[PDB]
Amino acid sequence: VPATRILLLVLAVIIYGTAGFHFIEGESWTVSLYWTFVTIATVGYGDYSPSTPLGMYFTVTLIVLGIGTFAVAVERLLEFLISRHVVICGWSESTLECLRELRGSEVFVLAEDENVRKKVLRSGANFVHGDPTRVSDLEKANVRGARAVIVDLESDSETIHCILGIRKIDESVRIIAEAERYENIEQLRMAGADQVISPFVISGRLMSRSIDDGYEAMFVQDVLAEESTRRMVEVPIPEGSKLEGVSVLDADIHDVTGVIIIGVGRGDELIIDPPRDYSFRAGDIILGIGKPEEIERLKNYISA
Amino acid sequence: DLEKANVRGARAVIVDLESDSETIHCILGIRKIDESVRIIAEAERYENIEQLRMAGADQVISPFVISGRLMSRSIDDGYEAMFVQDVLAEESTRRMVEVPIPEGSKLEGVSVLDADIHDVTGVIIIGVGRGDELIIDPPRDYSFRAGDIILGIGKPEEIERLKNYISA
Amino acid sequence: VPATRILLLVLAVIIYGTAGFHFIEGESWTVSLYWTFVTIATVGYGDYSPSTPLGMYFTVTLIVLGIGTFAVAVERLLEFLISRHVVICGWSESTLECLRELRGSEVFVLAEDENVRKKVLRSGANFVHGDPTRVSDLEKANVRGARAVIVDLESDSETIHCILGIRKIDESVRIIAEAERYENIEQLRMAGADQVISPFVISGRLMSRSIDDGYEAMFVQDVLAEESTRRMVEVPIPEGSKLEGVSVLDADIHDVTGVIIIGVGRGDELIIDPPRDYSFRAGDIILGIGKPEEIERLKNYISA
Amino acid sequence: VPATRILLLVLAVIIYGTAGFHFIEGESWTVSLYWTFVTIATVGYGDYSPSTPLGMYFTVTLIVLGIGTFAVAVERLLEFLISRHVVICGWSESTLECLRELRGSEVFVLAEDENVRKKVLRSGANFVHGDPTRVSDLEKANVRGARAVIVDLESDSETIHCILGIRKIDESVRIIAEAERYENIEQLRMAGADQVISPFVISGRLMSRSIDDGYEAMFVQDVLAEESTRRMVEVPIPEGSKLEGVSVLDADIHDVTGVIIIGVGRGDELIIDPPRDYSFRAGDIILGIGKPEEIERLKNYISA
Amino acid sequence: VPATRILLLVLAVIIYGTAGFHFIEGESWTVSLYWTFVTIATVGYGDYSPSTPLGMYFTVTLIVLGIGTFAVAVERLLEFLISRHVVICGWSESTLECLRELRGSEVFVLAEDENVRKKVLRSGANFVHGDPTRVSDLEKANVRGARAVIVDLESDSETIHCILGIRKIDESVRIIAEAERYENIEQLRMAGADQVISPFVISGRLMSRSIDDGYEAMFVQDVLAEESTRRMVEVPIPEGSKLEGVSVLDADIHDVTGVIIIGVGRGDELIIDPPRDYSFRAGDIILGIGKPEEIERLKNYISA
Structure with a gap:
């Protein structure tokens, strides 16, 4: 009444x-x-x-x-x-291990099951009940003012139908999707996801290199762990650095610092093992592997 | 029904079943048949990695942990997922390979600093594998051994320059 | 208790x-x-x-x-x-978009599922749990007093069974039905339905006419939306009008008002594009398209 | 608490x-x-x-x-x-029409569904929730002191498993079962049911006699209705009657009373159209069809 | 609030x-x-x-x-x-008849289904909702303090997974498991189970021995029922008994007491029909059949 x-x-x-x-x-x-x-x-x-x-x-x-x-x-x-948040659409085992890395930030979880409410609140994330393919139930999870949205639904048809619902709310948020089949990697990039992470193509291409020597699958599963002794961190080159225009051979990062420069990213392209005559700029994100005793040595060498 | 599929004469068994309990039970059935075959399992949950490796599997690839770590690292910039999903594809420009150190090589006891493999050849030495461990980014005083495995990333003509540089 | x-x-x-x-x-x-x-x-x-x-x-x-x-x-x-009502037999995707245009009136949704109780109560309708094929459950939903009954059930066998059940409760009420197959349009209409609306025959002909140019499908889905500029309205000719006895060629409604006379209907038939010799009578209903400023210029035109 | x-x-x-x-x-x-x-x-x-x-x-x-x-x-x-009863195991359409003629007696209904509670209490019968194949949930429905138990479950395997559970409680109650297939009529008599009523053998043998003339299926569906003019009632012959030892030809029931003697039952055997030299006794139950004005004429003629 | x-x-x-x-x-x-x-x-x-x-x-x-x-x-x-406990992993028809003889003690039934909460609480057991293959859900059910853990899950793949999960929590507790197939008896026993009870191998051999005469199956299902006359009991030989050093032929237990010495067990093995030269030692457990008046005549016989 x-x-x-x-x-x-x-x-x-x-x-x-x-x-x-x-x-x-x-x-x-x-x-x-x-x-x-x-x-x-x-x-x-x-x-x-x-x-x-x-x-x-x-x-x-x-x-x-x-x-x-x-x-x-x-x-x-x-x-x-009487920065901002991240939103996770769907609940699976890939988003359970993503929630362990995000304990410092605040996380909303948009899933349509009710049984999963005890698993989300244990991990330290607010649960929003709803269907993630609906624009009305996406706005309840604060998609519009998020930092990134992580889509992992049961199939690849619903993952596409959820990426297109997020792009109807705002076309500036960062969508990170997960592909179940290899053939749908190009459909999930046309719908609007910025990064498509296909785990069964990484796993299927590590179970075929581990027949003779299992060193390729031992390197990947170790440098991603933050409990390891070496870590893969992205070091950006600031504006007004001492290395603008300097080639890779003239810089010699591995001699003075001790990190291994396995790639340089400019914008949204990555060049793994860049050539000798590659000229640096300001804005290039350096992808390297080194000890934490060597990482701040690299930032103090490229500083302004 | 395992002995139908010739597990005795095989060189690798790749166990990927519908759940994590059936992957331990199939690994226990293989180790009764051939005790020295190389089993390559696949864990679903993270806590079952030490059980799949105790039950007998040599290498355990857990896909929901590699995908969970690459999701939360791609929120700011996604250069670590664009590295993993590109060195594995065999249509790419640069390949991640393994070369073995032969007996009687040019680098017996030679350290990695005075070898200068990236300067001489052009390949990126991300690790030196000895037996059943991998040392990612080995220190400067690391001395070689005839029988090591060098894991590296390089262009396909830079790998033939690596094998001729480590040749006997 | x-x-x-x-x-x-x-x-x-x-x-x-x-x-x-x-x-x-x-x-x-x-x-x-x-x-x-x-x-x-x-x-x-x-x-x-x-x-x-x-x-x-x-x-x-x-x-x-x-x-x-x-x-x-x-x-x-x-x-x-602590006018009359409308009864809706069955809950589907046709009777959901019908319920949004029937806001303000009393609507009783007779449905077999109890799951649909939340969606009916959310949209502004009273839910009456029952089987709409049972005559004892139609009378519970107050069919006899209603001004129209809308039947949209799972199959066309249950739609004729619900139509036959209303024709013995009240043999004067207005039944609107929805046909699924083209064979049952003259079967639902003989069993009592006053208006048979087949959505797969309209959408079957709008998909084979949108291949070359889709202006036939843009006209139909814009004159029915009650948020556009033009609105397909119908006005009746009252007794003692200024047009009771004039032809269409001499009335000349499009120039002096601004509406488009697509058709006129006398009784239970419709004449689309009436010829010039058509003599207007009393009681006729003029189906027309125009801006709502032009509709009031037509309504005063047909007055006493 | x-x-x-x-x-x-x-x-x-x-x-x-x-x-x-x-x-x-x-x-x-x-x-x-x-x-x-x-x-x-x-x-x-x-x-x-x-x-x-x-x-x-x-x-x-x-x-x-x-x-x-x-x-x-x-x-x-x-x-x-804040005589005795009858117990009905299971809820179907055959027990719904049985409950209409048992309004004078008190009826328990033992069914395992919860949705059927609104249909049982409307008809005037107490609902007992439980599985009828279990001896513990049969004793809640007062099987032990009943007048008759009526078993109509979903299949013929559960009807047998329920008849054998009633015979474990007491071997004197009257079980009236219903067979779904013709081949299981003899299994439901070995388990312990006293009367097996197979409706699809009565219906299938009335849809094959109604091709030429539908008079066989018009007689059966009419004399069972209590709203009919003639009714089929069983008139027992009391002890010390005027007809003991009298043949059917020497009695001439249809001449003096007006009922039609279509059978005589002794114990649990029925003789349809009994012969001329059939001698009556005391205890034989006369199955006849006549007007209600003729039935008390028959009881006053065979009285003591 | x-x-x-x-x-x-x-x-x-x-x-x-x-x-x-x-x-x-x-x-x-x-x-x-x-x-x-x-x-x-x-x-x-x-x-x-x-x-x-x-x-x-x-x-x-x-x-x-x-x-x-x-x-x-x-x-x-x-x-x-406003002794110790027993943990039962999984709810089935083997752990239901096990729970009736474990009345009086504390029993924790770890089960994945929530439907089974009513049947567990009815039989006198505390229900612990969880997955019994998860190590984090076994520790919730207090496995480490228990005196025995009874594992009976859906398959033999989940039974080895639940056995392997207990062997790292507590490497001293007594695990009783149930094998479904005959191949996994030596597989469940190597993974840690202290007693493997296969019900389809006992019932497979009692059905092929009941063809001629079923006295083998009447002996097994009567000496285990705790409502019969004779009871298969086992008594231990204490230190300083009157039999620590006598042979079975000279002890002659069947005549002077009345029990039947079907077997004796030392350590973790059992010797059925021990020969006459078998010297009794201390700590032995005598497996026997007899009336409970004869068991007390045996218990005083083996005293100090």
Whole structure:
């Protein structure tokens, strides 16, 4: 029942009780109003009470009509008196291990199951119930002001139908999708995902190199772990550095610092093992592997 | 039904079944038949890696951990997922390879600093594998051994210049 | 618990308390009745109270037996104190977009599934749980008083069965049905339906006419949307108009008003592009397209 | 919370309040007990109240510890305060029409669905939730002291598994089963059903006689209806009748009464169209068809 | 609403009421506090009440602001006031008849389904919802303290996975497992199970031995039922017995006691029908069949 209607009903009871007590028992309007509240709240001090048979009958009627009405009114009154985030669409094992790396940031999880609510709240992420393919249930998860959206749904048709729903809300957020089949890598880039991570093509191409020597699958599963002794970090070249225009052979990063320069990224292209005559600029993101004792040595060497 | 598929005469068994409990049970069935064959498993959950490796699998590739680590690292910049998914594809410009150190090579006892493999050849030495361990970014005082495996990234004509530089 | 049983239980408590207080404490029947209400409502003025050990014990028994009973009774009492309609048989994707245009009126959605109770109540419709093929469940949904009944069920066998069930309840109501196959258009219409709307024959012909140029499909889906500029409206010719007896060539409605006379309908037929010799009569309905400023210029044109 | 634990908790509050008021305020044990009930029920007559600071503090503690406890206790108490039969195992359309002719008797219905509870209580039969194939859930429906048990389950395997569960409880009740296939008529008689009613063999043998003339299927569906003019009733021959030893030709029932003697049943065998030299006895049940004006004429002719 | 916030809200009401009554009506701080509790709890003794118009208005405000707040507070308070064990992994038909002989002890049934919560709680066991293959859900069920763990899961692949998960939590606990296929008896036993019980190999051999005469299957299913006359019991040989060093031929246990010595077991092996030269030692366990009057005649026989 709308709160305002309950308000009118309790006011009507108050008028009924106050006028009745005033006319039947002859007490002042103020005393009668006070008696009405004391009675319908069931306080019943007994400083005022009916002394006539008509007043007794009237009081029983007020008790029956008023106590329930007042109770509902007080409970309704109770109610009125009393960088950015990342959004994860869907819940699977690939997003469970993504949630371990994101304990410092605040994470919303948009999934349509109800049984998964105990797994999300244990990991430290707010759960938003809803269907991620719907634009109305994507706006509940604050897709519009997010840092990145991570889409991992059950199939590749729903992952595409969710990427196109996010691009309808805003065309500036970063979508990171996951492909289940190899053939749908190019459909998930046309829909609008910025980075497509196909895990069964990485896994299937590590189970074919591990037949003779398993060193390719031992390197990949180790440099991604933050508990390892070496880490793969991206070091950006700041504006006004000492290396703008300097080639890779003239820089000699591995001799002076101790990191291994396995690639240089400019914009959204990556050149693994860049050639000797590659000229640096300001804005190129250096992808390297080194100890943490060597990483701040690299930032102090390229600093302004 | 394993001995139908010639597990005794095989050189590698690749176990990838519908759940993680069936992958341990199939690994336990292979080790009863041939105790020295090379099993390459696939873990679904992260906590089952030490059980698949205790039950007998030599190499355990867990795809939902490599994908979970590459998702959370691609929020700011995705150059670490563009590195992993490009050195593995055999249609790419540069290949990640393994070369073995032959017996009687030119680099017996030679350290990695005075070898200067990136300057001489052009290949990127990201690790030297000895036996059943891999040392990513080995230090400057690391001395070689005849029988090592050098893991590297380089252009396909820079790899033939690496094998002729480590030749006997 | 049925409300009437709760009524009897509270009356029994009232008799018990009143008789007990009267006999044990010696107060009048009226005072005893009043005391019983004051006590079981938990008001407790204290103008009357037991003064004997037996009365004290009795009062504790009345408190235990009566307070809960009275509480349940007042809450049950609360519930009873606190053009025509349209009936929609079946819930689907055709009757969902029909319900958005029928806002403001009373709509009763008769559906077999209980899962659909949340979507019906969200869109502003009263849900009536039942099977729409049962004659005893159509009468529950108040079909006989309605102004139109909209039938859209799972198959065309259940749509004829729901149409035949309405034709014996009320043989005058307006039934709108939805055909799924083209063979059943003349079968649903003979069994009683006043308007048969087949969505797969409209969309089957709009897909074979959009191959060359899709202007046939843009005209149909824009004159029905009630958020565009032009609106396909229909105005009736009243008795004693200025056009009761003129031909279409001499009336010349498009120049003097600005609407487009796509068709006129007399009775239960429609004449699209009426010829110049067509004499306008009284009671005719002019189907037209125009801006809503041009519709008011046509409505005053056809007046007395 | 188990009801008995709530009982202990409220008793503990009562002891606490009574002892406290007695010792702190010096009232008798009886007055103190009464005051405790009046207070924790929130009645608060004020005939007794604390007059010392310690008593005031104590009373606030009793209010906080006792009012909620008493409220939960009264609501739990609410719950506890607030020939023979026939039992029907399973709910289908054949038992729905059986329930229409059993409105004078009391009927239990043992079905495992919960959605069917609204259909059973409308028809005037008590619903017992449970699986009818279990002996523990058959004893809840009072199979042991029933007049007849009527088994109509989804298949013929469960109908057999339910007949053998009833015969484990008692081997004297009358089981009336229904066969779904013709081949399982002899299995349902070996399990223990006294009468097997196979409806699809009656229906399949009436749809093959109704091709030429539909008079066989018009006779069967009419004499079973109690709204018909003629009815098929079984008239037993009492002990000490005027017809013992009399043949059918010497009796001439159709000449003197007007009923049609279509069979005579002795025990559990029926002889349709009995021969001329069939000698009557006492105990033979006469199966006849006649008007109700002719039936009491037949009982007055065979009477003692 | 968090319980602590409700606490603050009710404290604020208490301060408001107490200060108001003290200043407006002039009663002491203690009386004012008491009056506030009596009023917001709706007790209303009436020993204290406002006697001024301002006090009456104030009291109505306290009634409206305080009664609901106090009610919510007491209900929240309600919530805060109100050998070793055996773990059973999985719920099936083997662990249901195991649970009936484990009455009296603590049993924790770790099961994935939530449907089985009613059957576990009915039979006298604590239900622990979890997946029994997860090491984090075995430790939740308190496996490390237990005296035995009984594993009976859906397949033999999940039974080895649950056995391997216990062997790293506790490498000393007693695991009893159930094999489904005959090939996995030596596979479950090597992975850690202390006793492998295969029900389809016992029942496979009792069905091929009941063709000629079924006395082999009547011996097995009668010496295990704990309601028959004879009971297969096992008694241990204590230190300093009268038989520590005698052969079986000279001990002659069957004549002097009345039990049948079907086998004796030393350590982790069993010798069925031990020969006459078998020298009894200390610590041996004598597996025997006999009436419970004969078992006490054997237990005193093997004493000091």
